[PDB]
Design an enzyme around this catalytic site. Structure first.
Site, mmCIF file in Angstrom:
data_model
loop_
_atom_site.group_PDB
_atom_site.id
_atom_site.type_symbol
_atom_site.label_atom_id
_atom_site.label_comp_id
_atom_site.label_asym_id
_atom_site.label_seq_id
_atom_site.Cartn_x
_atom_site.Cartn_y
_atom_site.Cartn_z
ATOM 1 N N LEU C 41 57.932 39.248 -8.568
ATOM 2 C CA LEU C 41 59.142 38.745 -7.943
ATOM 3 C C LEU C 41 59.701 39.748 -6.946
ATOM 4 O O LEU C 41 59.500 40.959 -7.055
ATOM 5 C CB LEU C 41 60.192 38.406 -9.000
ATOM 6 C CG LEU C 41 59.792 37.198 -9.843
ATOM 7 C CD1 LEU C 41 60.753 36.974 -10.988
ATOM 8 C CD2 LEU C 41 59.723 35.975 -8.956
ATOM 9 N N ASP C 42 60.411 39.215 -5.962
ATOM 10 C CA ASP C 42 61.014 40.012 -4.913
ATOM 11 C C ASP C 42 62.247 40.727 -5.459
ATOM 12 O O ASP C 42 62.757 40.404 -6.536
ATOM 13 C CB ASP C 42 61.371 39.104 -3.733
ATOM 14 C CG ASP C 42 61.553 39.861 -2.440
ATOM 15 O OD1 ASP C 42 61.428 41.101 -2.453
ATOM 16 O OD2 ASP C 42 61.807 39.212 -1.407
ATOM 17 N N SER C 43 62.713 41.731 -4.714
ATOM 18 C CA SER C 43 63.975 42.374 -5.066
ATOM 19 C C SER C 43 65.153 41.421 -4.890
ATOM 20 O O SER C 43 66.126 41.486 -5.656
ATOM 21 C CB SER C 43 64.162 43.644 -4.235
ATOM 22 O OG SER C 43 64.178 43.367 -2.848
ATOM 23 N N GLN C 46 65.204 39.503 -7.973
ATOM 24 C CA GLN C 46 65.813 40.257 -9.066
ATOM 25 C C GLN C 46 67.334 40.219 -8.974
ATOM 26 O O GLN C 46 68.019 40.108 -10.001
ATOM 27 C CB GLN C 46 65.298 41.696 -9.046
ATOM 28 C CG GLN C 46 65.637 42.547 -10.266
ATOM 29 C CD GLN C 46 66.930 43.323 -10.110
ATOM 30 O OE1 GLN C 46 67.373 43.593 -8.997
ATOM 31 N NE2 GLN C 46 67.516 43.720 -11.229
#
Ligand SMILES: CCCCCCCCCCCCCCCCCC(=O)OC[C@H](COP(=O)([O-])OCC(O)COP(=O)([O-])OC[C@@H](COC(=O)CCCCCCCCCCCCCCCCC)OC(=O)CCCCCCCCCCCCCCCCC)OC(=O)CCCCCCCCCCCCCCCCC
Ligand SMILES: CCCCCCCCCCCCCCCCCC(=O)OC[C@H](COP(=O)([O-])OCC[N+](C)(C)C)OC(=O)CCCCCCCCCCCCCCCCC
Ligand SMILES: CCCCCCCCCCCCCCCCCC(=O)OC[C@H](COP(=O)(O)OCCN)OC(=O)CCCCCCCCCCCCCCCCC
Ligand SMILES: CCCCCCCCCCCCCCCCCC(=O)OC[C@H](COP(=O)(O)OCCN)OC(=O)CCCCCCCCCCCCCCCCC
Ligand SMILES: CCCCCCCCCCCCCCCCCC(=O)OC[C@H](COP(=O)(O)OCCN)OC(=O)CCCCCCCCCCCCCCCCC
Ligand SMILES: CCCCCCCCCCCCCCCCCC(=O)OC[C@H](COP(=O)(O)OCCN)OC(=O)CCCCCCCCCCCCCCCCC
Lengths: 155, 177, 87, 99, 606, 128
Positions: C41-43, C46
């Site tokens: 998952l991408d930041s 998150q």
């Protein structure tokens, strides 16, 4: 506490400025005293004049309500920038635009109340008509005198 | 800006904090959940459009005008969680957060009302006062010369030892006393 | 009023929110499922997960604590620490 | 990225000690170890005895003094009869009936 | 006579008895809130008998029972005025307080200092009935400052919170600014009339009553939060919901309105005072209702609602209708306490959530709260033949048909439309639509304390305007002849407010994003007035409190002129005298110069 | 396009809008790491005493003592009489005294002149 950790006179030589910055536990590059115009500050640092509400509220503070650490040099008006008092936090609307909007709104409303007082509304009626000489005795008029007759007629 | 362990904010941290603040102020603007969900996907697309920018000066400039975009388009009364700062229930129960050391000031006739609790408290007190000199000599053998650079504390590097400076994190009062 | 939170209950609610998220398949997911290294998952993803945690449990996680929650077990343990569960 | 293993180990140990503390905040079932310790009584003690006291005070110490209780004199209408005298108030003039 | 005055004083002494019970305690009480609630139920029942025998005859009296203090020609006695105002406002306040405390037995149930809370709330009730039963200005000042201090102690209830202490000190600040004018009024009446008693004030009936009525208007501006001294009543929503429900909706906040109603023989002969009251009330009811349109905290919306209704009360005082204003007090108490109680039921059911953007779908989940909230909103806007019809509509029927400041009338009608707008804002964002609160639903309202406490104010909000307005005697002549566009003014303007805000509410479901304008930011940031004035006016004080007064004057200059210059003078003269070199030659040369100045220069030998 | 935010005294500039926040230089990292080091040393010196079981009392803060000594005792020894201090001490010291003297003297001369002519309504004024 000892004398050379208490505030002293205005620093002029750079070693005195560095000793003051070491005394207030801050960098020499960040230590700026109040300018010596003789107002009684001495070597006390001119902290940047921001409120305590502006601080990071999630930081682990030593004093949480003050939002203030131990040994950090307090502002000269720290009792003034407590969160019970003056907040200098940024506002969504500009300060001057807020003052113009509030001043214009209050001045316009007072102007229009004066306008409506100059030109009042009313009903298309005559005066309220009271018997007994416009109620002479009931309004405290003395009976030993005699008023003028106020006479009302049918319509 | 102001962080306990980090000395600054990276560009990545600034972008993520701006992204969260933009979504929160957008949810304040866009009250209904489907409508916010639509505009939140549109704002995520706007953040994804410049995600692959290897030029750091261009990326810092885009961050700057995105902050200007945010400061223009923020809600005047954004939503704040109740126990979050600025909330309506924030620091409400701090008057009920009596510190633990006041239990040392009790009369013995009201300490005898809870014999198991204070008998269980004295071993915590004993544990802390034996752990103290071990964690002091742990701190002075691990802190560099010139003092600690960051505010990060170490864990217990042995077994049986407690982490240094642990008492007021563990024995802090509850949020709802 | 105000029913108490358990680590089983907090775990079930955190994984329940992550199972309602289309970028996570529910059978690969566990409490140790790292978001960038396992789930990929991408930041930004998150940040959206931590905001869903805030909207779920009704309190704000600060960003300096939000940017370190990189698995569901650390999120459950942070909510355990800030709600003082298993008294 | 997230935590460092130093921060992970420290927050794990602090979490364990915090949960032990919160567990040791609980109560034994014998605790609190305490020291060894008329249906309309509210209408009698809070109503009827205060009505007795305040009526005694108003009747034999307040109205015995002048102008302490000054009542507005009762509104008199045409057709009334005075209880003290028996004087009948005469009625009004007959009305110029309107409807 | 012996029944009326007896139960009159039995009501007040009955209220003071649980204060002696809580001050003479040793044990943990077996439900002291139930004891205080039973006490106020019985005090309501006791106060209904002099109310019934005032409906019977119109029996008014004065109990000047205890001679307290004679300052040479001013005899201050403990004097209680039982007139229409006391006979109606005391049972309404007791009934509302009884509902608020049965609410408080549930809302404050987890509080370990609940007995202190009921002690403070009963002390507030005692001081408010000292205020409204007072016959002289000193005892009214006692009740006045008493409800101000209990407002302080009940706003700052969670005293560890900084904002509660800040709002409580704010409320004290604005009330003391009003107290300047109140003490101005007491000063004028003592100096010009040798009295603080209402009877001598009304019998002497002065015509130079500009200055004391300006003082009383300033007192009401402080106490009822009119414009200029308004923001503390929205700030006062920081206290608990029974505090914002009893004190800050219905009972304390009408004391300035009640103060100007109490002096109606002076305002009925001062057209300038009526003009000032009309303009100030219209300004307040416009501004606060306009600020209410864009707020999201529900207690702030209901606080701007009650300040708008206080502005409407000041309007109907300003058109020389004091008894309609007092009828609107007694009317407004029921449904506004009920609106705060329903909002507190929503706040407690949503885990202390006060923002309306985390609500919705509460029509069916909270059916009794929804029912009573809709009944309260319809009573607030003036649905026909609910309680708010029986005063407020008549207010409009006297606001139109009178020699009126026309801008004040038009802003009053715009405020009347704004009431409907914020009422359906509450109903729309709270009860209608789909949920926005979090996922662990603990919605519950099945406590008989909550149900009965909203139920009695529900019966009040359905029937109390009808009952009271058919039990009061006529004190003016009601204007009942007016054209059909004028008779239908309030109802049509209220319905148009509902329709325009239905358009506003349905434009929120649209999938469009708009930037906020300057009207929106002006209404949402409280007319910019707590932003500017609470930053500026402390600043120019506190710097002046430190830099000018503390540092410059009383640490430096007043320290410089008397002690420091004289001390340095004595030091310098001491050093000039004692700097002698011990040389005998110079001392005898000085003696020679002494003898020469003695002979030739001063002639001490002639 | 966008109105630039103008910071005032009672409304400062936000951190998100300040250009000097976006300095990525080496010397700003030097200053920020040195401030972090000073703040961490102060934090460590605080909580080595704060967490001490033997200490029972007040952790004396030299910053607080230093603040109160600056606010009270250091004011006169660092005062210099000059143009600015004389004009401000005579402007805020005796200016209001002159002002209220002439206001109250004018009001009382007007009042006494009305009273000794029989003009001021002092009819029921027998308390003074
Ligand atoms: C006397 C009049 C003043 C003259 C002496 C001044 C001091 C000595 C001097 O000159 O020192 C320089 C010199 C070296 O001193 P220095 O190095 O300047 O030390 C001072 C520092 O520089 C510090 O810096 P500075 O020089 O800028 O500040 C000095 C400071 C100046 O102060 C300031 O700079 C700040 C304050 C502003 C000025 C003072 C304002 C005072 C206002 C009056 C008080 C309040 C009244 C309120 C009234 C309200 C109703 C209207 O002056 C003083 O401290 C002296 C005050 C007056 C002295 C006499 C006081 C007697 C009091 C007895 C009880 C009553 O000393 C000498 O040479 C010694 C001999 C002095 C020569 C003779 C001077 C003239 C005498 C004429 C005859 C007087 C007869 C007696 C009259 C009064 C009694 C009837
Ligand atoms: C539980 C205790 C209750 C009593 C239990 C035992 C008694 C049982 C019942 C019998 C009643 C007692 C006997 C009768 C009572 C006394 C009668 C009597 O003549 O008493 C003499 C007098 C009556 O007044 P008086 O006018 O005769 O005397 C005043 C004295 N001179 C004239 C010199 C000024 O005093 C009292 O009764 C005192 C009672 C005071 C009650 C109210 C107190 C209020 C406190 C507020 C203080 C500040 C007020 C400031 C503002 C004032 C207004 C501006
Ligand atoms: C019919 C006529 C009607 C006339 C109407 C208008 C008359 C009055 C005119 C305006 C004067 C009153 C308003 C200005 C002062 C308001 C001060 C105040 O309430 O400050 C509140 C402020 C905190 O407020 P806030 O930031 O909202 O808090 C929540 C988050 N912290 O709290 C603080 O910052 C703490 C401040 C503590 C120190 C106070 C310093 C200022 C004192 C001002 C005294 C004013 C005296 C006026 C006398 C008038 C005489 C006639
Ligand atoms: C008092 C009599 C009230 C009833 C008669 C008037 C009804 C009315 O104004 O209806 C208009 C409107 C409902 O219709 P609208 O929302 O325009 O269209 C969607 C379909 N309902 O709007 C409403 O009905 C809402 C306003 C009702 C006001 C009632 C209280 C005064
Ligand atoms: C209203 C009256 C206003 C004036 C009050 C009197 C002066 C102020 C109070 C007394 C002096 C205060 C003081 O301590 O001044 C300090 C200064 C030096 O004193 P020193 O002896 O050095 O102190 C001990 C060592 N630290 O002390 C000095 O320089 C000496 C001060 C002597 C004061 C004598 C007063 C005489 C009054 C009549 C004059 C004609
Ligand atoms: C006038 C003037 O310029 O005074 C300045 C003078 C010091 O001269 P400087 O400006 O340093 O050159 O300073 C002086 O001469 C000393 C002060 C002059 C007198 C000031 C009088 C009023 C002080 C406040 C009194 C409050 C009561």
């Amino acid at each position: 506490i000892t004398k050379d950790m208490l505030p002293g006179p205005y620093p002029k030589t750079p070693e005195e400025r560095a000793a003051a910055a070491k005394k207030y536990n801050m960098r020499v590059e960040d230590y700026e005293p109040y300018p010596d115009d003789g107002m009684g500050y001495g070597d006390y640092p001119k902290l940047p004049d921001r409120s305590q509400q502006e601080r990071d509220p999630w930081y682990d503070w030593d004093h949480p309500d003050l939002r203030l650490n131990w040994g950090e040099p307090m502002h000269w008006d720290l009792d003034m920038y407590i969160r019970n008092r003056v907040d200098t936090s940024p506002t969504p609307v500009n300060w001057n635009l807020m003052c113009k909007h509030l001043f214009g709104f209050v001045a316009f409303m007072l102007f229009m109340f004066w306008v409506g007082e100059t030109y009042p509304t009313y009903q298309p009626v005559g005066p309220k008509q009271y018997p007994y000489n416009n109620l002479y005795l009931e309004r405290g008029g003395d009976p030993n005198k005699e008023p003028e007759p106020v006479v009302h007629y049918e319509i | 800006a102001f962080l306990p362990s980090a000395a600054y904010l990276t560009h990545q941290q600034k972008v993520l904090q701006l992204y969260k603040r933009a979504l929160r102020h957008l949810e304040s603007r866009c009250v209904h959940r489907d409508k916010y969900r639509y505009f939140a996907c549109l704002l995520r697309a706007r953040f994804d459009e410049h995600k692959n920018e290897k030029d750091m000066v261009k990326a810092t400039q885009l961050l700057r005008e995105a902050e200007k975009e945010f400061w223009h388009g923020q809600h005047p009364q954004p939503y704040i969680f109740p126990e979050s700062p600025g909330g309506t229930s924030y620091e409400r129960y701090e008057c009920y957060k009596v510190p633990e050391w006041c239990l040392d000031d009790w009369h013995p006739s009201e300490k005898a009302m809870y014999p198991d609790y204070f008998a269980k408290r004295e071993q915590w007190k004993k544990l802390r006062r034996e752990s103290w000199e071990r964690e002091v000599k742990q701190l002075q053998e691990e802190t560099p010369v010139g003092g600690p650079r960051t505010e990060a504390l170490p864990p217990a590097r042995k077994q049986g030892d407690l982490p240094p400076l642990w008492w007021h994190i563990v024995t802090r009062p509850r949020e709802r006393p | 009023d105000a029913p108490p939170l358990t680590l089983e209950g907090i775990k079930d609610r955190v994984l329940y929110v992550l199972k309602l998220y289309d970028k996570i398949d529910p059978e690969k997911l566990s409490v140790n499922s790292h978001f960038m290294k396992d789930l990929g998952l991408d930041s930004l993803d998150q940040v959206e997960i931590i905001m869903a945690m805030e909207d779920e449990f009704g309190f704000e996680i600060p960003d300096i604590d939000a940017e370190k929650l990189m698995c569901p077990q650390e999120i459950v343990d942070y909510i355990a620490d800030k709600k003082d569960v298993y008294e | 990225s997230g935590y460092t293993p130093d921060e992970k180990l420290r927050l794990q140990q602090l979490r364990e000690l915090r949960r032990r503390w919160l567990k040791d905040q609980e109560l034994s079932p014998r605790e609190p170890v305490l020291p060894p310790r008329r249906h309309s009584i509210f209408a009698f003690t809070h109503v009827l005895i205060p009505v007795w006291i305040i009526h005694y005070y108003l009747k034999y110490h307040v109205t015995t003094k002048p102008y302490t209780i000054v009542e507005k004199k009762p509104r008199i209408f045409p057709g009334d009869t005075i209880l003290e005298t028996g004087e009948v108030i005469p009625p009004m003039k007959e009305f110029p009936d309107q409807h | 006579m012996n029944l009326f005055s007896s139960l009159t004083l039995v009501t007040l002494i009955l209220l003071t008895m649980p204060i002696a019970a809580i001050n003479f305690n040793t044990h943990k009480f077996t439900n002291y809130p139930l004891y205080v609630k039973t006490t106020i139920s019985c005090a309501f029942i006791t106060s209904m008998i002099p109310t019934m025998m005032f409906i019977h005859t119109g029996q008014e009296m004065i109990i000047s029972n205890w001679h307290w203090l004679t300052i040479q020609t001013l005899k201050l006695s403990l004097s209680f005025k039982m007139d229409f105002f006391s006979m109606m406002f005391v049972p309404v306040a007791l009934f509302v307080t009884w509902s608020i405390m049965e609410f408080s037995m549930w809302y404050m149930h987890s509080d370990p200092n609940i007995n202190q809370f009921f002690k403070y709330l009963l002390l507030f009730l005692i001081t408010m009935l000292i205020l409204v039963t007072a016959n002289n200005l000193f005892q009214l000042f006692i009740g006045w400052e008493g409800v101000g201090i209990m407002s302080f102690l009940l706003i700052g209830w969670w005293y560890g919170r900084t904002d509660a202490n800040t709002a409580a000190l704010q409320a004290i600040l604005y009330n003391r600014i009003g107290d300047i004018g109140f003490i101005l009024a007491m000063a004028w009446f003592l100096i010009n009339l040798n009295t603080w008693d209402l009877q001598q004030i009304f019998m002497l009936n002065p015509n130079d009553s500009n200055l004391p009525l300006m003082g009383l208007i300033l007192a009401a501006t402080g106490k009822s939060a009119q414009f200029g001294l308004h923001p503390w009543l929205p700030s006062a929503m920081e206290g608990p919901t029974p505090v914002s429900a009893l004190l800050h909706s219905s009972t304390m906040v009408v004391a300035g309105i009640f103060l100007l109603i109490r002096f109606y023989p002076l305002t009925e002969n001062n057209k300038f005072g009526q003009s000032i009251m009309l303009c100030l009330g219209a300004m307040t009811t416009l501004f606060t209702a306009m600020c209410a349109l864009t707020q999201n905290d529900i207690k702030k919306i209901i606080a701007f609602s009650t300040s708008s209704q206080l502005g409407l009360m000041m309007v109907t005082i300003g058109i020389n209708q004091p008894h309609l204003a007092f009828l609107h007090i007694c009317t407004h108490a029921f449904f506004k306490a009920m609106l705060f109680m329903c909002s507190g039921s929503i706040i407690h059911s949503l885990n202390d959530e006060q923002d309306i953007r985390k609500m919705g779908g509460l029509f069916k989940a909270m059916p009794f709260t929804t029912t009573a909230l809709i009944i309260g909103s319809l009573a607030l806007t003036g649905m026909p033949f609910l309680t708010g019809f029986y005063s407020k509509d008549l207010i409009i029927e006297s606001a139109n048909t009178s020699y009126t400041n026309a801008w004040a009338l038009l802003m009053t009608l715009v405020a009347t439309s704004f009431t409907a707008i914020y009422s359906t804002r509450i109903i729309f964002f709270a009860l209608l639509g789909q949920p926005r609160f979090p996922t662990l639903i603990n919605i519950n309202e099945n406590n008989p304390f909550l149900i009965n406490s909203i139920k009695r104010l529900l019966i009040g909000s359905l029937f109390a305007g009808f009952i009271i307005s058919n039990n009061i005697p006529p004190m003016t002549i009601p204007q009942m002849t007016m054209p059909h566009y004028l008779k239908m003014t309030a109802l049509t303007v209220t319905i148009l407010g509902f329709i325009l805000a239905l358009e506003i509410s349905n434009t929120t479901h649209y999938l469009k994003f708009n930037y906020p304008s300057n009207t929106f930011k002006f209404s949402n940031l409280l007319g910019y007035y707590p932003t500017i004035m609470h930053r500026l006016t402390p600043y120019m004080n506190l710097t002046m409190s430190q830099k000018s007064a503390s540092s410059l004057l009383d640490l430096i200059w007043l320290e410089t002129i008397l002690p420091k210059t004289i001390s340095l003078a004595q030091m310098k003269m001491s050093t000039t005298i004692t700097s002698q070199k011990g040389l005998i030659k110079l001392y005898f040369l000085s003696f020679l110069i002494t003898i020469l100045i003695s002979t030739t220069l001063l002639n001490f030998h002639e | 396009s966008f109105p630039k935010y103008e910071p005032s005294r009672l409304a400062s500039l936000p951190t998100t809008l300040d250009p000097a926040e976006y300095d990525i230089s080496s010397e700003t990292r030097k200053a920020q790491a040195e401030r972090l080091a000073i703040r961490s040393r102060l934090k460590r010196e605080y909580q080595l005493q704060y967490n001490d079981p033997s200490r029972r009392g007040v952790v004396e803060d030299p910053a607080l003592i230093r603040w109160t000594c600056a606010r009270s005792a250091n004011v006169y020894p660092n005062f210099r009489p000059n143009t600015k201090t004389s004009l401000l001490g005579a402007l805020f010291g005796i200016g209001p005294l002159i002002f209220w003297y002439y206001v109250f003297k004018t009001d009382r001369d007007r009042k006494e002149k009305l009273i000794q002519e029989g003009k001021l309504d002092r009819t029921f004024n027998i308390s003074y």
